[PDB]
């Protein structure tokens, strides 16, 4: 089927640009379980011309992996090899021969944005300026992907990494799709994306575009302002069908300006063409930044 | 889409036979995460005519549930309401109004078969007679499902429960499908079943029938004889495409008779029509049982 064709090609085709000697990689502790497997911390000897050891993260499958998870790991490789942006996590290499498939990616010293924020306090002291900075960085990375006609489909604070210098890195591309041809991606079966982050047309009609990524960015903006809060708090996920279709949205959270909340609401308009594009969002966030000084 | 139609019907249609008052249910500790959500231990007051409290298990979604997981919870309800067999876990009720969707099911005091076996020793002392008994009980439950034209699709020791009296209960029906019409179920997208338990035609061609459940039962038979061992040990899941197609199978494990291993191999024939049916499997297991006395 499609996956056996992909697996075989991946193993057969050995892009020297990407293949890395397993004997030069040492795996350490588990950093998490992501969308399709586990991520561990690792170190890589003489990676990409760099002398000595480089600390990296490695994405791999678990023993009980399903075909869906394997597909997602290959999808993530296929996308990450094509993109390069200061706010998108970097692919360094892969191991595809003589052992389990491993992706070698940039290590983000602070982990996920949601973890980073939940460990902080609003005044780790983070100001509203810091939060707006985080959001803007993410919007920049998404402008780039959107220009590349890539839809991420799972934008959420758990899928943003926080690197050296508190720099945002969009990550977890296993579910991301190319929409160059048709400007949308449609999935006939049910999504494997949490209900509370999907745009209304994704949830009901299974349609994904850069405008549904904008809806998810609105939910991410709410996670940022609440320092890692849980969206639609106390609302069971299955109630989101009725809640969204009858025009309800999350309320303005505590320490959130009127301007920032209006931006979330515009991201959550029912009609996708009425939502901002990422270029608009970055502009809104820049303006809030300079107004605050 | 299909899921919003299902959700709405489930909430709207209130089969009095199944609906249970939330105020009569008390939830306790988490027993696990299953295929689509979490299972907790609970107690239910005046359940199904029974005086007083009854200990039960409750299946529910997590806050981050995807549409796939919600679909699977509804699928499980739809199937469990139709089946009744001493080796299939029982549905007692559901809560579908004024709060999160909850399925109320029979509590199995010993948990999963895989956990039960890994806590045991071969001589908890379990004899080969006990192990064969477990396998037979499971085969009986699968004969019944197969006669009902239901394919389970995720038969594995983690999805068998061990009740009072060490009685097997097949469980986790979220992925199970009706094949009354066509005698197969085909899934166009990738499966969410661990690669190491799927039949070769399920893995490559996405075809599921009662004969692919027979293949998975062979892997379950291997888990039983190894007291909870991990299938294809040390073999990455993505290598199973090449391994199975070139005709390789698991080796005979340590404390396993020649007859029992031949039964596993017959379950794993490449051609589904050459595998035994569950009625044959039960007969093989009964004969091994009486031969041992
Ligand atoms: N590249 C990475 N660098 C650091 N931690 C990571 C990386 N990718 C994933 N993680 C961690 O693994 C978890 C699962 O995605 C994340 O929440 C984060 O904690
Ligand atoms: N009906 C049940 N009774 C008892 N434990 C259960 C039940 N369903 C699931 N579990 C537990 O939850 C885990 C997840 O399925 C199982 O491994 C088992 O430990």
From Swiss-Prot, chains A, B:
Record note on what altering residue 31 to I does: Confers resistance to vandetanib, lenvatinib, cabozantinib and nintedanib inhibitors
UniProt: ATP binding residues: 31-39, 59
Natural source organism: Homo sapiens (Human)
Site, as annotated: Breakpoint for translocation to form PCM1-RET: 13-14
Active site: 154
Domain named Protein kinase: residues: 25-293
Result for mutant: residue 107 to N: Confers resistance to vandetanib, lenvatinib, cabozantinib and nintedanib inhibitors
Protein name: Soluble RET kinase fragment
Resulting phenotype, residue 59 to R/M: Loss of kinase activity. No effect on interaction with and dissociation from CBLC and CD2AP
Topological domains annotated Cytoplasmic: 6-293
Impact reported for residue 92 to F: In HSCR1, pheochromocytoma, MTC and MEN2A; familial form
Outcome of mutating residue 153 to Q: In HSCR1; sporadic form
Domain of life of the source: Eukaryota
Effect seen on changing residue 174 to S: In a patient with renal agenesis; uncertain significance; constitutively phosphorylated; expressed only the immature intracellular form
Substitution effect: residue 39 to A: Confers resistance to vandetanib, lenvatinib, cabozantinib and nintedanib inhibitors
Consequence the record notes for mutating residue 192 to A: Enhanced protein autophosphorylation due to enhanced substrate presentation in trans
